[PDB]
Design a protein around this ligand. Structure first.
Ligand SMILES: *[C@@H]1O[C@H](CO)[C@@H](O[C@@H]2O[C@H](CO)[C@@H](O)[C@H](O)[C@H]2NC(C)=O)[C@H](O)[C@H]1NC(C)=O
Ligand SMILES: *[C@@H]1O[C@H](CO)[C@@H](O[C@@H]2O[C@H](CO)[C@@H](O)[C@H](O)[C@H]2NC(C)=O)[C@H](O)[C@H]1NC(C)=O
Ligand SMILES: CC(=O)N[C@@H]1[C@@H](O)[C@H](O)[C@@H](CO)O[C@H]1O
Ligand SMILES: *[C@@H]1O[C@H](CO)[C@@H](O)[C@H](O)[C@H]1NC(C)=O
Ligand SMILES: *[C@@H]1O[C@H](CO)[C@@H](O)[C@H](O)[C@H]1NC(C)=O
Ligand SMILES: *[C@@H]1O[C@H](CO)[C@@H](O)[C@H](O)[C@H]1NC(C)=O
Ligand SMILES: *[C@@H]1O[C@H](CO)[C@@H](O)[C@H](O)[C@H]1NC(C)=O
Ligand SMILES: *[C@@H]1O[C@H](CO)[C@@H](O)[C@H](O)[C@H]1NC(C)=O
Ligand SMILES: *[C@@H]1O[C@H](CO)[C@@H](O)[C@H](O)[C@H]1NC(C)=O
Ligand SMILES: *[C@@H]1O[C@H](CO)[C@@H](O)[C@H](O)[C@H]1NC(C)=O
Ligand SMILES: *[C@@H]1O[C@H](CO)[C@@H](O)[C@H](O)[C@H]1NC(C)=O
Ligand SMILES: *[C@@H]1O[C@H](CO)[C@@H](O)[C@H](O)[C@H]1NC(C)=O
Ligand SMILES: *[C@@H]1O[C@H](CO)[C@@H](O)[C@H](O)[C@H]1NC(C)=O
Lengths: 49, 49, 263, 384, 48, 48, 48, 49
């Protein structure tokens, strides 16, 4: 009926505790937000199901 | 059915230290990989049932 | 001195089985409660280890190849297995390494050594003093050009014993990698008569020697008028490492407790 | 400014509709830096390595082991006497912030056309026949004109290269061979013969030679980093060690951010670092006092903002998810956390939920229909 | 990249040699999330 | 890359220059399989 | 091309140190004499 | 080239152009007929490949 809800902090996965990596991740624009939107879409719908 | 986490109040009390090591989830949490709780507890599912 | 001790019996080349031995810590990292996958020069499981003896009659000290590294183990009593020679010519045309545990200290050295055809060490057995003492060193005639030399702080290690079965197993891994001779080792108590014990136990690293030399062959050194003698009954086994992937099960506290050879 | 202004930003809208919104994970920041290095007092032998009276021949290159010493690479770096100083697995500035397990100086002399062949993955009779560096060489190549030290007017033929070899030599291999190269199909025994060559040839190094034909002294520093117990280190003083506080640690060059803690992990005497399933360090043996330290990343979690929309009110409640009300108040703005906002640290309604910690919402015993879903049986709503 | 550990690039290399290595790790890890979220979006349709 | 044939790279370039061209082909090829397997995982749901 | 604001920075150095006029550098000219911004837009011109 | 019945004087050195042919030196470097063959940018073995 459901699966485990997950949420992934896209900056902390890629660039964990690093400011330099964080300033470089900004060069890929919305990609991390798109990932968190998609996981929030899945995770809200496990409570719908 | 034997689960690996469900967002059951992680509090670095058992994670930080001996239990950061042997735990898929402690490595999950520390890297932005979080598991969220369902909206309905296993008691509320049982009341509807 | 330098002498050939030719009084021995001719026997064919023996072998036995490396069941689950020759596994060592592949790095200087702590791990626990984990099954870790690594590719390195390990002893292939259940390989033919080539088998050697000292008896009464037999004093098996052949000059053996050393290719991609070596596993060496001795089931031992009365401290018979005392060291090893390594090199590619052994006749002072090129350098060679000596590792020796004498009666008092360990010596480790690299030289253009001129080795004997039969290298060994010898002990005066119960000669009116009730104790036993080392007296003969006959391994090389000279050691002119040398480039690495170490001697341990002094001790006395005993050279006596006549119990039937073996009470000690001693295991060593020798890898000569990129100018470094790496030694890994284990000791365990046993109660076995004539074969390599079935079981598992991993070898901790113990010394890393920066020796820099080519090694292509090796030979072990045994304790013993010039000809006619009694050897102590002790037995040793030799295997060759290969690039094999291993899965390593670390327990709770933090030590290898089982392994799987992926090939 | 405030958690609502983070959601307005996160969504790129000045109006936020009713809901529970995901926001930046909070993370408690380091109170201070720690530095810890093995205490060695003698400075490494740079005057022996870079200033010997004679160097080796390239065919028989010397290798000196540098160990149990402090390395001040600022002396080598800042000195103008060097024409080449290139590093291949470190930037040259970082050499002083860092430690090395075993370090070596490969010392020899070559022509100024050949310095290019000393770089890893190269070809020509130096890279091919007498000094090959590995594909992953970690270290620095250091080179300078020594015409005034080495060269004599008729030719310093003491410096020898190898012109012939059966095969390209392996990385860091040295070859003392003087055995005769067979260029014809014939075998060739003894000292000499027709189309038989002595494999070595000498440089006619003279001061009247053009630049490039002069003797360049080379040192190649080789070293390996961060993988085993250090024995050579840069000119950094250790700080005191602190525990149970979040800090920017650095042990042997193992820079990081974490809470340090006394560990019960029984490291065997050869071990120094402990690695997690994720291939990051999670324990360290302190190099001055040989106790094991657990390393934990400083406390962090999801933040989510629960709002009743912008059209109604601006008031919001904040869920620190998977976090107990304790780690909240620990998150005091005194220790720098990501969120520049700390206004909610007031509480007096800091409800604890299975889902986490809820700040800014009152906990009413009465049970209503779920409005904004918080998780684990809890919901929130905006009411009188 | 030279290492899997982000701090062993940033404590070894400077501000201009690191950027080459850090960006291989940003590219590889970002593609690791885009793989996981694709798997999980397809998965969520099997559960739906 | 300078060619689609993996041996034409290795025949014409040294280790560090071939590793650049080969990493293009690996990055490309791998992105071909991750596209194919995504199409097949979606198409397997149409068939399921 | 066209340029919004333009500045010519004029000075004399030793010929070795022309390299230290590259962006992202270090050494006594690049340290405390004439440091460039790491994302410098411009051209460096030198003659004996 | 190598077997001509008369060579030029050095003050009037010849210049024979060569094309549309294969360079097998196996009757050449492999023969002791020359008291000096030296190449200066190639190994004499590599001339075939
Ligand atoms: C031990 O015996 C070997 C031969 O079995 C001796 O080796 C010979 O040494 C001489 C020079 O002294 C050489 O001319 C022979 O060619 C060698 N023979 C072999 C088969 O190698 C060796 O010298 C003897 N050593 C001692 C100490 O007597
Ligand atoms: C949040 O942490 C506190 C500790 O700070 C927990 O309180 C402990 O609870 C146990 C079990 O009832 C008691 O035996 C301890 O004495 C308590 N310690 C203190 C100092 O309060 C609390 O249970 C935790 N809450 C959750 C939801 O995990
Ligand atoms: C260098 C070379 O090839 N020389 C040959 C020679 O040996 C041979 O006798 C002659 C016959 O015409 O042709 C030419
Ligand atoms: C080991 O030795 C025996 C002879 O005693 C031989 O038949 C066998 O094939 C060998 N085993 C392996 C695995 O090489
Ligand atoms: C042990 O051997 C070494 C050389 O191998 C020698 O220097 C030393 O004197 C010996 N010790 C004894 C007690 O014989
Ligand atoms: C007995 O021991 C002494 C030294 O303790 C030694 O000098 C002597 O030679 C020994 N006697 C015999 C017969 O070995
Ligand atoms: C080794 O011995 C030979 C023969 O005497 C000598 O020519 C050479 O210089 C020696 N090498 C060293 C390093 O002493
Ligand atoms: C050691 O010497 C032997 C004999 O010359 C040779 O075949 C072997 O390749 C050498 N080993 C190394 C690592 O060069
Ligand atoms: C693990 O710890 C237990 C209890 O302290 C002990 O009995 C056992 O010997 C330990 N194992 C190892 C491999 O150290
Ligand atoms: C070598 O020694 C001289 C002193 O004789 C010193 O002036 C020079 O700077 C030293 N060179 C290096 C590279 O340290
Ligand atoms: C570091 O120095 C202290 C004294 O300053 C000493 O206790 C300690 O032994 C030293 N470190 C090591 C590894 O010996
Ligand atoms: C809120 O929005 C509604 C329309 O949705 C409007 O009728 C009302 O006047 C607004 N109130 C305020 C305080 O903005
Ligand atoms: C919730 O109910 C308990 C009795 O179970 C009562 O003591 C407490 O005061 C109530 N809380 C509120 C906020 O009314």
């Amino acid at each position: 009926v459901s699966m485990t809800k997950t949420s992934v902090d896209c900056t902390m996965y890629i660039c964990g505790d690093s400011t330099e990596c964080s300033n470089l991740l900004l060069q890929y624009g919305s990609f991390c937000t798109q990932l968190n939107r998609a996981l929030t879409g899945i995770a809200v719908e496990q409570d719908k199901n | 059915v034997t689960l690996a986490d469900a967002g059951f109040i992680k509090q670095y009390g058992d994670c930080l230290g001996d239990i950061a090591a042997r735990d898929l989830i402690c490595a999950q949490k520390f890297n932005g990989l979080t598991v969220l709780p369902p909206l309905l507890t296993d008691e509320m599912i049982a009341q509807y049932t | 001195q330098c002498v050939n001790l030719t009084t021995r019996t001719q026997l064919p080349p023996a072998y036995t089985n490396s069941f689950t031995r020759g596994v060592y810590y592949p790095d200087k990292v702590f791990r626990s409660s984990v099954l870790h996958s690594t590719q390195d020069l390990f002893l292939p499981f259940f390989s033919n280890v080539t088998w050697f003896h000292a008896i009464h009659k037999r004093f098996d000290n052949p000059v053996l190849p050393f290719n991609d590294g070596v596993y060496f183990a001795s089931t031992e009593k009365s401290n018979i297995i005392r060291g090893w020679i390594f090199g590619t010519t052994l006749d002072s045309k090129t350098q060679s390494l000596l590792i020796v545990n004498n009666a008092t200290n360990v010596v480790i050295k690299v030289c253009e050594f001129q080795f004997c055809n039969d290298p060994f060490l010898g002990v005066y057995y119960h000669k009116n003093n009730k104790s036993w003492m080392e007296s003969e060193f006959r391994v090389y005639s000279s050691a002119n050009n040398c480039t690495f030399e170490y001697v341990s702080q002094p001790f006395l290690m005993d050279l006596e014993g006549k119990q039937g079965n073996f009470k000690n197993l001693r295991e060593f891994v020798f890898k000569n990698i990129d100018g470094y001779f790496k030694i890994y080792s284990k000791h365990t108590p046993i109660n076995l008569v004539r074969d390599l014990p079935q079981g598992f136990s991993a070898l901790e690293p113990l010394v890393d020697l920066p020796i820099g030399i080519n090694i292509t062959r090796f030979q072990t050194l045994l304790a013993l008028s010039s000809s006619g003698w009694t050897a102590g009954a002790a037995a040793y086994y030799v295997g060759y490492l290969q690039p094999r992937t291993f899965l390593l099960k670390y327990n709770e506290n933090g030590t290898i407790t089982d392994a799987v050879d992926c090939a | 400014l405030d958690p609502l202004s983070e959601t307005k930003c996160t969504l790129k809208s000045f109006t936020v509709e009713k809901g529970i919104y995901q926001t930046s994970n909070f993370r408690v920041q380091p109170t201070e830096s720690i530095v810890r290095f093995p205490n060695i007092t003698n400075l490494c032998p740079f005057g022996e390595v870079f200033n010997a009276t004679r160097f080796a021949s390239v065919y028989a290159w010397n290798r000196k082991r540098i160990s149990n010493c402090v390395a001040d690479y600022s002396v080598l770096y800042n000195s103008a006497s060097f024409s080449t100083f290139k590093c291949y697995g470190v930037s040259p500035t970082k050499l002083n912030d860092l430690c090395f397990t075993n370090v070596y100086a490969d010392s020899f002399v070559i022509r100024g056309d050949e310095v290019r062949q000393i770089a890893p993955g190269q070809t020509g009779k130096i890279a091919d026949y007498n000094y090959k560096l590995p594909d992953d060489f970690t270290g620095c190549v250091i080179a300078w004109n020594s015409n005034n030290l080495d060269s004599k007017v008729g030719g310093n033929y003491n410096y020898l290269y190898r012109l012939f070899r059966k095969s390209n030599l392996k990385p860091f291999e040295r070859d003392i061979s003087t055995e005769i190269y067979q260029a014809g199909s014939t075998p060739c025994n003894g000292v000499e013969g027709f189309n038989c060559y002595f494999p070595l040839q000498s440089y006619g190094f003279q001061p009247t030679n053009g630049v490039g034909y002069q003797p360049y002294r080379v040192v190649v520093l080789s070293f390996e980093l961060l993988h085993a117990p250090a024995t050579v280190c840069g000119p950094k003083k250790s700080t005191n060690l602190v525990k149970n506080k979040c800090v920017n640690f650095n042990f042997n060059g193992l820079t990081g951010t974490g809470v340090l803690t006394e560990s019960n992990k029984k490291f065997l005497p050869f071990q120094q670092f402990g690695r997690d399933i994720a291939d990051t360090t999670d324990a360290v043996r302190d190099p001055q006092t040989l106790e094991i330290l657990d390393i934990t990343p400083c406390s962090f979690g999801g933040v989510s903002v629960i709002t009743p929309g912008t059209n109604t009110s601006n008031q919001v409640a904040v869920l620190y998810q998977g976090v107990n009300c304790t780690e909240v108040p620990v998150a005091i703005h005194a220790d720098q956390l990501t969120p520049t906002w700390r206004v909610y640290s007031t509480g007096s309604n800091v409800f604890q939920t299975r889902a986490g910690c809820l700040i800014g919402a009152e906990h009413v015993n009465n049970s209503y229909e779920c409005d904004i879903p918080i998780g684990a049986g809890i919901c929130a709503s905006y009411q009188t | 990249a030279i290492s899997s550990v982000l701090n062993d690039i940033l404590s070894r290399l400077d501000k201009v040699e690191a950027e080459v290595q850090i960006d291989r790790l940003i590219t590889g890890r970002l593609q690791s999330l885009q793989t996981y979220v694709t798997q999980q979006l397809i998965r969520a349709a099997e559960i739906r």
